[PDB]
Paper text:
Here, we show cytokinins induced the strong expression of the M. tuberculosis gene Rv0077c. We found that Rv0077c expression is repressed by a TetR-like transcriptional repressor, Rv0078. As previously reported, Rv0078 forms dimers resembling other TetR-like proteins. Rv0078 has an N-terminal DNA-binding domain (DBD) and a C-terminal ligand-binding domain (LBD).
Residue numbers in the entry:
A (entry chain C), D (entry chain D): 7 to 200
B (entry chain B), C (entry chain A): 6 to 200
The structure:
Amino acid sequence: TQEERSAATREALITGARKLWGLRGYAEVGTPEIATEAGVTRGAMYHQFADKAALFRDVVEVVEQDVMARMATLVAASGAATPADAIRAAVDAWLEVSGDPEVRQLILLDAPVVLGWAGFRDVAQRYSLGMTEQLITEAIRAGQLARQPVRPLAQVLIGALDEAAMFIATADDPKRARRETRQVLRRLIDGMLN
Amino acid sequence: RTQEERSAATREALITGARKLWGLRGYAEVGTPEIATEAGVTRGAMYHQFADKAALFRDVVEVVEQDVMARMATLVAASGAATPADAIRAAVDAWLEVSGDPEVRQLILLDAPVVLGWAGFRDVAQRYSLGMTEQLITEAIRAGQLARQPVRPLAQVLIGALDEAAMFIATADDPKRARRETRQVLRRLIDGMLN
Amino acid sequence: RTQEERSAATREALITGARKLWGLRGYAEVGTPEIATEAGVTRGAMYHQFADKAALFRDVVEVVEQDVMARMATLVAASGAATPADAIRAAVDAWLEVSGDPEVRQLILLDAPVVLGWAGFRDVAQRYSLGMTEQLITEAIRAGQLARQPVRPLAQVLIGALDEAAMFIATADDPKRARRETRQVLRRLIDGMLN
Amino acid sequence: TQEERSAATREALITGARKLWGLRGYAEVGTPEIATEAGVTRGAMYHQFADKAALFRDVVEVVEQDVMARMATLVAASGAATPADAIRAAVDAWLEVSGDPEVRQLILLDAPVVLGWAGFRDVAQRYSLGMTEQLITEAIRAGQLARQPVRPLAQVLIGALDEAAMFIATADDPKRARRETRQVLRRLIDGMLN
DNA sequence: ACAAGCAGACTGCCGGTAAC
DNA sequence: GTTACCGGCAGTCTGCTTGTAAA
């Protein structure tokens, strides 16, 4: 089909920019390198996508959805029994998933700069952020956590989690960093609950 | 008259202009021509004073970060805190005020980790806001107000929380309500962290 | 207009202009801005048709070298030679005519070995003047007018002697006398090389 | 004293530029690199020498006189007996000396383009060129070579020798190339001497 | 004799538009 | 789909000019 082929070149470009941008940063890979690696011409790319930024937008979407997939896998398998335990299992899950350098480059470093903080927020509300808003909402609902404004709490905890990830990855002894950071995140969480 | 002065003066104009412009529009979105022009200098003199665009951004980060600490310490002194715990609460409220500056949000919260790399900017913040967070925790532990725990991780995590808090307040649809509510969840967080 | 024609048209204008200017002043002494401006195109369109300055110089060389061969063959045909020896003599007299063109001396005798490398330019000349020399020698052997010997070495050596002959005539203070005398020693050299 | 100190940095600049330009070409080394290798600053370089060209001129001078030195050694050691045999030995001597890659880069390639063909000529008249003019003059003088204009002949034979050198250096089988080129030069010379 | 500040210029490259 | 093309940029060079010495 003619439009069925469009999706195939968009997948080749999205896969390639994800690999390359994930390896080195959005600024440090240009559209030529990316087109070459995808097996398409710069012209076709600028036909399927508005600009470099828009291709970064669809890369972000794909990556974030994978993060949610792998995370839910870990959270379901943890086997929590109360919303609070679900929150802790989510924390440990992100700690496992944020170990991926692709995720840190695309989501934690480049995305707020490419799409703008509000822009990436509009994207993350349909993913990790909004799932945090829901975990908080459920923990409030089941009486494990004081009623309070949810949007702020979720954003802040997301901040703590993101920076947790960078700290563990760049620390000189990563095993001890993951242990101690997990400890303090737990202590922080329990101090939040009842 | 002297060259020590001539260098320093050109660096002062270049850092001033790059701070203004980069802060208004982002590091990616302003080129060295525009920066030179606004500074009243030639691109050549700039590439003599600074290695590349990145090196100039590093000195802009430096000035901005110390400016952040100056303003914060000013606000904390006037509050009249008396114990590490009070210092922590007054610090949070202070950052909420200072981070109202969009130049601070653009340069420090967004670009710096991208331009310098995350560990690079960290090496910078340990000598400023990060290091102060480490001292506030460390003294709060000493004074028995906060349980002994690994200090560097806690400090980094709390910094992450405060940063995304400031971005949240700035970009909210009604910033007054967002500042009030965000202060709320930060306070509850602290109080649950302390005794 | 077609795309192959739009490319061919700008490539011809860049080659024409780079030929004019580089021939007037040397490859080192003319930049791609001047060259584009003279072609009436943007530096960007140029870096689309040509890899870099060097690649454009390579195509300029190619054009100039075939113009050299064309002018040479015209003059030699007009001599009315009939044997390989007569062809060799008429060739020398032709090179003396053609190398009067300073554009030829500038681009081929001076810049080309430095830009493309001695081996690189040789790879180019082997398909033009050098190859014509190798064939003129080869036929001179075939007809028994010249002693059997390694052909590539003789061809390269005679080329060196001819080139420096051209520079010599061009830069001498009385050029008319220089062409007469230089022609003399080349003729004697040739006759001593033949029988 | 200041003149003893001044002269020494020009020796270090000239040695450093000789090594470097000789390795990579005049176009491919900048004055910064050259200052660094000499152990001096660009300001000192531009105080002792007018421009990049001026340092190249003094490098040319040194190299050319070194060529004449080594050549004189081999020509003395061969032991010719008449001007003609002096010429033949001179050629084989150059063939040996031109084996040096520094000499081929600075004298045979860059110098005419940097200094201009006439400029380098004015330099070579006090060395290999002018000596060639003298060997021709003496060969005419002893009746071994026909009376003819000397300047043109000397320039031409210099051309044949120079290009001979590059051919031997760049050839795929350099041993066979030295044999064959020596051969064709011998035949040329003998056909010249009568 | 040396050093530093500085200015004009240049090369190769990129991102996005528009003509094929 | 594709190829030509434009405005603009970052980092480097070269030589000039103003400052700071070791004689």
